[PDB]
Design a protein around this motif. Structure first.
Motif, PDB file in Angstrom:
ATOM      1  N   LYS A  58       0.848  -1.179   0.000  1.00 52.04           N
ATOM      2  CA  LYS A  58       0.000   0.000   0.000  1.00 52.04           C
ATOM      3  C   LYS A  58       0.889   1.236   0.000  1.00 52.04           C
ATOM      4  O   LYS A  58       1.845   1.321   0.777  1.00 52.04           O
ATOM      5  CB  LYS A  58      -0.907   0.027   1.233  1.00 52.04           C
ATOM      6  N   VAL A  59       0.579   2.188  -0.875  1.00 49.84           N
ATOM      7  CA  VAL A  59       1.304   3.461  -0.943  1.00 49.84           C
ATOM      8  C   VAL A  59       0.365   4.645  -0.724  1.00 49.84           C
ATOM      9  O   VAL A  59      -0.795   4.624  -1.148  1.00 49.84           O
ATOM     10  CB  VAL A  59       2.056   3.630  -2.277  1.00 49.84           C
ATOM     11  N   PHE A  60       0.868   5.658  -0.028  1.00 53.73           N
ATOM     12  CA  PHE A  60       0.142   6.887   0.223  1.00 53.73           C
ATOM     13  C   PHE A  60       0.994   7.967  -0.422  1.00 53.73           C
ATOM     14  O   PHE A  60       2.184   8.113  -0.087  1.00 53.73           O
ATOM     15  CB  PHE A  60       0.072   7.184   1.726  1.00 53.73           C
TER      16      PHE A  60
ATOM     17  N   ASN B  50      -4.949   3.725  10.393  1.00 47.06           N
ATOM     18  CA  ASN B  50      -6.395   3.867  10.389  1.00 47.06           C
ATOM     19  C   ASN B  50      -6.996   4.057  11.780  1.00 47.06           C
ATOM     20  O   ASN B  50      -8.194   4.330  11.903  1.00 47.06           O
ATOM     21  CB  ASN B  50      -7.033   2.636   9.733  1.00 47.06           C
TER      22      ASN B  50
ATOM     23  N   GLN C  64      -5.619   9.039  13.376  1.00 43.38           N
ATOM     24  CA  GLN C  64      -6.448   9.815  12.441  1.00 43.38           C
ATOM     25  C   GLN C  64      -6.754  11.192  12.994  1.00 43.38           C
ATOM     26  O   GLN C  64      -6.947  12.154  12.254  1.00 43.38           O
ATOM     27  CB  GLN C  64      -7.778   9.107  12.165  1.00 43.38           C
TER      28      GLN C  64
ATOM     29  N   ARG D 224      -4.824  14.430  11.897  1.00 44.17           N
ATOM     30  CA  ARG D 224      -5.202  15.191  10.716  1.00 44.17           C
ATOM     31  C   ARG D 224      -5.759  16.572  11.081  1.00 44.17           C
ATOM     32  O   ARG D 224      -5.778  17.493  10.254  1.00 44.17           O
ATOM     33  CB  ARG D 224      -6.284  14.459   9.920  1.00 44.17           C
TER      34      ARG D 224
ATOM     35  N   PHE E 265      -0.526  14.380  11.365  1.00 39.65           N
ATOM     36  CA  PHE E 265      -0.712  13.103  10.690  1.00 39.65           C
ATOM     37  C   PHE E 265       0.376  12.885   9.650  1.00 39.65           C
ATOM     38  O   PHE E 265       1.059  11.873   9.663  1.00 39.65           O
ATOM     39  CB  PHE E 265      -2.075  13.080  10.002  1.00 39.65           C
TER      40      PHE E 265
ATOM     41  N   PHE F 269      -8.324  13.293   2.706  1.00 44.28           N
ATOM     42  CA  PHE F 269      -8.515  11.885   3.093  1.00 44.28           C
ATOM     43  C   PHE F 269      -7.865  10.895   2.120  1.00 44.28           C
ATOM     44  O   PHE F 269      -7.625   9.735   2.476  1.00 44.28           O
ATOM     45  CB  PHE F 269     -10.011  11.548   3.258  1.00 44.28           C
ATOM     46  N   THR F 270      -7.592  11.351   0.900  1.00 39.95           N
ATOM     47  CA  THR F 270      -6.912  10.524  -0.107  1.00 39.95           C
ATOM     48  C   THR F 270      -5.466  10.953  -0.285  1.00 39.95           C
ATOM     49  O   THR F 270      -4.577  10.110  -0.349  1.00 39.95           O
ATOM     50  CB  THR F 270      -7.605  10.581  -1.487  1.00 39.95           C
TER      51      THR F 270
ATOM     52  N   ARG G 147     -12.560   8.284   9.420  1.00 45.44           N
ATOM     53  CA  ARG G 147     -12.238   7.938   8.027  1.00 45.44           C
ATOM     54  C   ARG G 147     -12.727   6.518   7.696  1.00 45.44           C
ATOM     55  O   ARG G 147     -11.945   5.566   7.641  1.00 45.44           O
ATOM     56  CB  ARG G 147     -10.733   8.132   7.718  1.00 45.44           C
TER      57      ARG G 147
ATOM     58  N   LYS H  73     -17.747   2.531  -0.074  1.00 43.98           N
ATOM     59  CA  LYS H  73     -17.182   1.995  -1.310  1.00 43.98           C
ATOM     60  C   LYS H  73     -18.121   2.391  -2.428  1.00 43.98           C
ATOM     61  O   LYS H  73     -19.179   2.966  -2.159  1.00 43.98           O
ATOM     62  CB  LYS H  73     -17.015   0.472  -1.245  1.00 43.98           C
TER      63      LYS H  73
ATOM     64  N   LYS I 195     -18.464  -0.588   3.090  1.00 45.98           N
ATOM     65  CA  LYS I 195     -17.406  -1.577   2.870  1.00 45.98           C
ATOM     66  C   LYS I 195     -17.834  -2.943   3.427  1.00 45.98           C
ATOM     67  O   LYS I 195     -17.471  -3.990   2.877  1.00 45.98           O
ATOM     68  CB  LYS I 195     -16.102  -1.107   3.529  1.00 45.98           C
TER      69      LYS I 195
HETATM   70  N1  LIG Z   1      -6.346   3.567   4.469  1.00 48.01           N
HETATM   71  C1  LIG Z   1      -5.940   4.862   4.402  1.00 48.01           C
HETATM   72  N2  LIG Z   1      -5.614   5.366   3.174  1.00 48.01           N
HETATM   73  C2  LIG Z   1      -5.202   6.653   3.043  1.00 48.01           C
HETATM   74  C3  LIG Z   1      -5.102   7.505   4.236  1.00 48.01           C
HETATM   75  N3  LIG Z   1      -4.670   8.713   3.849  1.00 48.01           N
HETATM   76  C4  LIG Z   1      -4.504   8.660   2.508  1.00 48.01           C
HETATM   77  N4  LIG Z   1      -4.817   7.428   2.033  1.00 48.01           N
HETATM   78  C5  LIG Z   1      -4.753   7.013   0.609  1.00 48.01           C
HETATM   79  C6  LIG Z   1      -3.927   5.749   0.414  1.00 48.01           C
HETATM   80  C7  LIG Z   1      -4.627   5.028  -0.721  1.00 48.01           C
HETATM   81  O1  LIG Z   1      -3.883   5.246  -1.925  1.00 48.01           O
HETATM   82  C8  LIG Z   1      -5.988   5.690  -0.855  1.00 48.01           C
HETATM   83  C9  LIG Z   1      -7.100   4.670  -0.680  1.00 48.01           C
HETATM   84  O2  LIG Z   1      -7.334   4.407   0.700  1.00 48.01           O
HETATM   85  P1  LIG Z   1      -8.351   3.279   1.236  1.00 48.01           P
HETATM   86  O3  LIG Z   1      -7.511   2.268   1.980  1.00 48.01           O
HETATM   87  O4  LIG Z   1      -9.485   3.921   1.975  1.00 48.01           O
HETATM   88  O5  LIG Z   1      -8.993   2.663  -0.105  1.00 48.01           O
HETATM   89  P2  LIG Z   1      -8.565   1.284  -0.827  1.00 48.01           P
HETATM   90  O6  LIG Z   1      -8.904   1.487  -2.285  1.00 48.01           O
HETATM   91  O7  LIG Z   1      -7.169   0.857  -0.452  1.00 48.01           O
HETATM   92  O8  LIG Z   1      -9.618   0.256  -0.192  1.00 48.01           O
HETATM   93  P3  LIG Z   1      -9.333  -0.828   0.971  1.00 48.01           P
HETATM   94  O9  LIG Z   1      -7.920  -0.581   1.467  1.00 48.01           O
HETATM   95  O10 LIG Z   1      -9.534  -2.145   0.241  1.00 48.01           O
HETATM   96  O11 LIG Z   1     -10.411  -0.512   1.999  1.00 48.01           O
HETATM   97  O12 LIG Z   1      -6.067   6.713   0.144  1.00 48.01           O
HETATM   98  C10 LIG Z   1      -5.480   6.888   5.526  1.00 48.01           C
HETATM   99  O13 LIG Z   1      -5.420   7.603   6.546  1.00 48.01           O
HETATM  100  N5  LIG Z   1      -5.868   5.597   5.536  1.00 48.01           N
END
Ligand SMILES: Nc1nc2c(ncn2[C@H]2C[C@H](O)[C@@H](COP(=O)(O)OP(=O)(O)OP(=O)(O)O)O2)c(=O)[nH]1
Ligand SMILES: Nc1nc2c(ncn2[C@H]2C[C@H](O)[C@@H](COP(=O)(O)OP(=O)(O)OP(=O)(O)O)O2)c(=O)[nH]1
Ligand SMILES: Nc1nc2c(ncn2[C@H]2C[C@H](O)[C@@H](COP(=O)(O)OP(=O)(O)OP(=O)(O)O)O2)c(=O)[nH]1
Ligand SMILES: Nc1nc2c(ncn2[C@H]2C[C@H](O)[C@@H](COP(=O)(O)OP(=O)(O)OP(=O)(O)O)O2)c(=O)[nH]1
Ligand SMILES: Nc1ncnc2c1ncn2[C@H]1C[C@H](O)[C@@H](COP(=O)(O)OP(=O)(O)OP(=O)(O)O)O1
Ligand SMILES: Nc1ncnc2c1ncn2[C@H]1C[C@H](O)[C@@H](COP(=O)(O)OP(=O)(O)OP(=O)(O)O)O1
Ligand SMILES: [Ca+2]
Ligand SMILES: [Ca+2]
Ligand SMILES: [Ca+2]
Ligand SMILES: [Ca+2]
Lengths: 434, 454, 445, 450
Positions: free
Chosen positions: C14-16, C36, C41, C44, C64, D53-54, D325, D329, D421
């Motif tokens: 996983k990359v951010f 998470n 969190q 932030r 954060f 958040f992304t 957060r 989905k 989700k």
């Molecule tokens: N999990 C998470 N991702 C973050 C955060 N901050 C930025 N991101 C970025 C990293 C990922 O490229 C993008 C997608 O995060 P998510 O984990 O919510 O969605 P993902 O498509 O990976 O779904 P999943 O991990 O399967 O629930 O958001 C954070 O605080 N937590």
């Protein structure tokens, strides 16, 4: 003691690179190849040839490009191993036993390149891909000695990746396909040194979507836009840099200069020493690999310097124009057959003013597999199906059809001729008349 | 009627794409003509950093692109000066924009007398790039002269005088040659850009914001002190991390001895073999014209080296090989030459004992021998100082008000290295009293430094 | 078959996306779960630099992103340590890669106990973010603890012992906390990037090529000493140009005095008006829980300040206004407190004389903090030299404390300018101003 | 005495900006406007809202964006006066008497924005443009007080630039066009803070070729490629940043959290106090300007923390999801008509598992977002990026550039369906339902089974 195949440097070796930050070397084999005679000589050959006449920062060597291709290849292999190994995915995964061969092929892919390739191969009928294979497979080279140390069949195996005969499609396509490490490096590198970095696509974004599969190399569907960006950057680089008219104007001069030199040599009534020792086997059309390996960019320019003092008016002038940067000017035209009458006329005008049109004119157009997207499904879709108008950009002609002539013809005692000549040129476009 | 050559301007601005400055802008016909001249075009075929490319493989940039770079910063300074700090509002402390063209020509032409690997070349052949720049500017045979003379008969001499610092306008002189001039600023930024190192960590824009003229030359507003500080830091870091790199210098020592050997061979009346180095002949003979000099570039040297690999002199052939195949000499630091002297003599003895002529396979040099001077200001010497101007118009020199700059000028240092073949450092099944020598030699190297024979 | 939590690798990295480091890379399920988690969190919503954004408007980055950044630098160090300097190769002077998860967790969690506007808050409310960091890691009520306890029951205390520097591995302790650590390297790089004051950009990749473990902790190769110099120089430029900025401190004084006034109003039985600041009530009283503290972030405070602009206490109302509207106290430099004491006392009288209560409208301030070098360089033979031995003047620079003593007071005191008429009240402003020459106190009776 | 109009600072004030290096301020009016309560208020409002958040670097404020729009504008005005004045070009030139109005409008264009304004306008029927015009023209405002000192009609003049009624197209198109300072700053600023390379085009190259003419702003033909790359950056930021489904998943939660709160407040049967007094005039639908000016991001999050403990399971849960957060989905579908029954059935299953479909699902288009694609209309001057040829004639960008025509060609929006989700998974009794649900989700898209 460890097989050479497996010799890992105890401390990772890094080389500073403006484009990639660092080139990283883990293997003794790779280090040895970097240090070899025939890879080192690539320091003395420009990646972009005559483009440095338009973009003066474009002074980068083929050596730094070769290292960059190896570095991008390495990064692909790491990611494939971390994320898409056979261990996890089986038949659609990556087998890291293939790393070493893939990295050597990547590093050695351009070793057969000589100075100003396009022009050189036009005049002397050389082929840099066959010379690459010859360098890899010939006991006389340090490269071959290094490869042969890996195993008896290894030099040929590495050649077979380059010739695309290697039986693993993941390896073949990492080295050679539409979006490969070769292309990604030179787009990034040519953009960095020219300063025309419209060819900034994001390399890391691509490295996050690239994957293996049983048929070769694909890209996750979620990174389709990253792929679009690459296609766009490549388009921008061809249009703005590689197809540049001023660069090609210098290239036409070089082409005629080498040709005139060869003509002078081949002719037995020309009793004068060209002092061009290293070019002699190529004037004769009969050379060895050793002789080919002695050539580089500086060899040519040294010879051209000597030639400004040669009793031939054309050779002396053409040598001078190359060294002093005096490119031929050009006008655009879209139909060769319909412009034939107009071009012939103008060529008579150029001649009447005392330029021999054979060496002072040219007709020029250039400096001269799919892309599979993979769904979560596992199934493949070609880029064009999802993104046709961008796919259309990649397939375009971009043919920049041109007629080259001396700048002198534009605005002695033939001024009425220059005004007659320049009447057939409006805004860099050839005007067709009687 | 016809516009004077001096005042002539291009119908539209000419722009040269530059990776460091984004664009080089040309507006004067004179400047365009000078860029296009033979003597300036020549600089395309001479590397800015010589042997640094063996360590930083991106460092293939030319003296041409550095010259355009310096011209461009100068152009940017003149513009700021004219818009903000003209004589039209400051008088004797302002900038007279009559000087623009002369400043621009000087900036563009400042490095025109450089040859290939000039530091080494000057060591072996006794050439002088400053003398030759002035010679190029003032001799009728050159295109540079014909252009300058076309501006006015006295113009060549005036341009030349800026470069020799004899021109009577301190603002013009210091813009081209001081402790923070367009020249140093460009090569730090550009050398950093091509090597791929951070060390050109300084912001030209934050410096162009505070630069201003005054009665005695060029100064920097006090509110921009920290921007000047970063310039000094970059300077220091580029020196100690790039210009002074031991591997680059290892390659420079090979080069130096290679050319020295060729010279010794040619001038030895009983060495008969053709060196096939016609363009170097005038320099072996120590009797050369300007024309012969202008025919030299990096590729001429490189071409001759290729031929020399096959010349029946064992040292020459080998050193040509080492330079072309990248086989640098290794080195160890020492401190006191006098204290190290017997140790060095003994090590040269062991080097000779294994077949290496120590005259060509060893060397001693300092970072101080290199054309890279540290910032060391002096109250008695005005051109040694970087002046800051307080908001009352009062001038103070940089180190007195910056602890950081004082600290870097305070740790300014030249190292001392002994060079030798890498083969002196190397598992074999049997140890000959000849294999013993290498083992003996190694016990004198520890932590990259000589151990004194004590 | 079933994989222990500590070992659970993500099948895909996983990359951010991060503007400073380009990418933050996560391999472990444990790390992702920690990212998470509720209490990470929450960072932030806490600015890394507090009041600096009033001077450098780009400095709006959160705690954060700093935490993820420290974590990312740390794993880059661990990767280089494993590749080049493992116990396998170097024995006692090498890196044990079993220490990785704990080093990673400690790096990610090091700042978790930080609340909003940390320096000011702790001055007025006497909280301690280090002790709260340890509280968060070891208290079963936090999601962070629940996560670490699943790694192993003893794991939360081990992670805490890294932060408290009591963990028996010096390499791990010093990676997290020492003179050149992932923590400092990140904030210097992040703060430079967001402020646009990119003087404090040394080269991270160069330092990562010289950093090295040994038996006693962390060291830097001798051939990399100039890269160490670069970092010392960048840290110095950041301290002088950003962290010690007189104007951000101007805002900090207002905030300090505003919080103190509110606390005092709440404390005073005379003042019966409702401050509407329910989440601050346990803090007014000096008796708070972890749960109450975790609810606090920058927004909470700015929301309360908005309300306070309408509260019938003119000092509170005005101070709140000054904080939201950006009206910093102005300042003048003085040198030694003892010579300047009588002059300062006089200026507080003049200030009181024109209606400003000097308890709230003046301050003595010399840092963002409200009222020596130890870097080992390693030779090829493995012996150690301290940086100051090879580079003394650069070493002096690091140990030097930038003492910027200032007296803060309202802009209105010199705001006036040119009056048509002066009376014996307008006279106080003009008399005040005569004690300030070019940003410095003039030491008169 | 200098008229306020012309009052320059004794010394130019600089603001360090990581995007433009420096923001330069010379006029006293502009500094006074920067320092005004209404502009300072933009410090506490995030430019990109839920994108953080992304892309966690995307924490930059609207205040910093507004200074950047002002700085680019200033650079254009300097270039215009220096190279393209009326004195030399006539009617195709720039009148530098327009400088101050242009600069004030650039600084004030986004002043009416509140917190998470797209979501906020949807739930509370706010209009940030109308409020910008209200801030500029209402006497109670510091902005108005500053502008009214300049000249009599100046406030309404400034507002007329923003509404595009100002009778100088050079001034109007500098603030608002297909290639205005506004777009240019946010593409650059957003790319810089998200850490994405995409939205980085060369501002310097564009400023080299920018030009006024009788009908507005044009770009020299010899600079087409720099304009091309602005479009490329614009396209790249839309598809990769602004339209990101994960940021949008968070927006959907936020929308529903505020919606639930409004609903709870309206209903007299719901007793409990939401203790969100600054949102009350908006809950009730009846609010003043001052009440609006009190709002910012921090106010919302402060209320969400409180709402986590309000005895409403939905409101408390959604406040939790936003603060912790927990984005919804999503899956793509083509059109609402064909996909209608599938959505209905999915909502049934989401409900069966115990999520109220009204607050835990949603349909969304990228088109609904405040991001317009380049779509040049040959009749509509406004829609066009013009390139000036040597002879002075104009040609629209897509006409000479296959690259731009290609990007404008596939400038499409999308459609998404949102869900928890939780619907995609060890001990559940609802495992049968989860299995069925996700059979309708293939390759990130809705499978039209029903
Ligand atoms: N999990 C998470 N991702 C973050 C955060 N901050 C930025 N991101 C970025 C990293 C990922 O490229 C993008 C997608 O995060 P998510 O984990 O919510 O969605 P993902 O498509 O990976 O779904 P999943 O991990 O399967 O629930 O958001 C954070 O605080 N937590
Ligand atoms: N003139 C010239 N241009 C150079 C040089 N190095 C790079 N360039 C760049 C700048 C020019 O815009 C571009 C095209 O070169 P030219 O000026 O020879 O071509 P152009 O067709 O513009 O000729 P012109 O002078 O406009 O008739 O190449 C140089 O040494 N001389
Ligand atoms: N070996 C090698 N290094 C290169 C080349 N181009 C640039 N470099 C850089 C990478 C390193 O930063 C530096 C190292 O130079 P060398 O490997 O010749 O010396 P080093 O002392 O590191 O290795 P050694 O102990 O002599 O085997 O030069 C190249 O073609 N070969
Ligand atoms: N005035 C003002 N400055 C800001 C703002 N944001 C960042 N800055 C920066 C630029 C200023 O040069 C720096 C110092 O702020 P001030 O103007 O409040 O104090 P300074 O003492 O420089 O000016 P003064 O003597 O009070 O007029 O802060 C803002 O919103 N307003
Ligand atoms: N001399 C040049 N002038 C302009 N562009 C060049 C020049 N040389 C190379 N390029 C560009 C076009 C090429 O596609 C690319 C380098 O590829 P290269 O190693 O030369 O393989 P190639 O000559 O077979 O390419 P291609 O098939 O497009 O002619 O860079
Ligand atoms: N509000 C602030 N104003 C100015 N500078 C700050 C502020 N907050 C932090 N800094 C500076 C000082 C610190 O050295 C550095 C970050 O360290 P950090 O752990 O986030 O704060 P801190 O409370 O531990 O201060 P310190 O590191 O000096 O003990 O940035
Ligand atoms: Ca290649
Ligand atoms: Ca120079
Ligand atoms: Ca920290
Ligand atoms: Ca805007």
């Amino acid at each position: 003691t460890i097989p050479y195949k497996e010799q890992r440097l105890p401390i990772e070796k890094v080389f500073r690179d403006p484009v990639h930050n660092y080139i990283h070397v883990q293997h003794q084999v790779i280090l040895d190849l970097i240090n070899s005679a025939e890879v080192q000589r690539l320091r003395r050959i420009k990646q972009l040839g005559t483009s440095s006449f338009t973009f003066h920062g474009a002074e980068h060597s083929r050596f730094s490009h070769s290292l960059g291709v190896y570095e991008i290849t390495r990064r692909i292999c790491e990611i494939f191993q971390r994320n898409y190994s056979v261990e996890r995915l089986g038949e659609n995964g990556w087998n890291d036993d293939e790393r070493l061969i893939t990295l050597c092929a990547a590093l050695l892919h351009d070793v057969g390149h000589g100075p100003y390739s396009h022009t050189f191969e036009h005049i002397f009928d050389t082929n840099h891909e066959a010379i690459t294979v010859q360098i890899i497979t010939s006991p006389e080279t340090e490269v071959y000695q290094i490869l042969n140390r890996v195993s008896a069949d290894f030099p040929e195996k590495v050649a077979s990746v380059i010739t695309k005969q290697y039986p693993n499609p993941q390896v073949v396509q990492m080295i050679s396909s539409q979006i490969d490490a070769d292309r990604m490096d030179y787009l990034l590198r040519d953009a960095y040194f020219t300063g025309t970095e419209y060819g900034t696509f994001d390399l890391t974004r691509i490295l996050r979507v690239i994957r293996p599969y049983k048929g070769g190399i694909a890209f996750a569907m979620n990174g389709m836009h990253a792929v679009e960006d690459y296609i766009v950057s490549r388009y921008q680089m061809y249009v703005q840099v590689y197809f540049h008219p001023v660069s090609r104007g210098m290239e036409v001069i070089l082409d005629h200069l080498l040709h005139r030199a060869k003509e002078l040599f081949e002719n037995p009534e020309f009793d004068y020493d060209l002092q061009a020792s290293l070019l002699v086997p190529f004037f004769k059309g009969d050379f060895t690999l050793q002789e080919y390996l002695k050539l580089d960019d500086g060899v040519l320019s040294t010879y051209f310097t000597q030639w400004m003092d040669v009793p031939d008016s054309i050779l002396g002038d053409l040598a001078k124009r190359f060294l002093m940067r005096k490119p031929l000017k050009s006008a655009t035209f879209t139909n060769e057959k319909e412009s034939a009458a107009t071009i012939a006329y103008l060529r008579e005008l150029i001649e009447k003013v005392g330029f021999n049109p054979k060496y002072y004119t040219a007709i020029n157009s250039s400096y001269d597999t799919q892309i599979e997207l993979m769904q979560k499904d596992g199934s493949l879709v070609e880029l064009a199906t999802v993104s046709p108008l961008v796919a259309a950009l990649a397939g375009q002609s971009q043919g920049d059809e041109r007629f080259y002539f001396p700048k002198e013809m534009l605005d002695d005692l033939f001024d009425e001729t220059y005004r007659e000549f320049s009447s057939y040129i409006h805004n860099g476009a050839l005007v067709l008349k009687k």
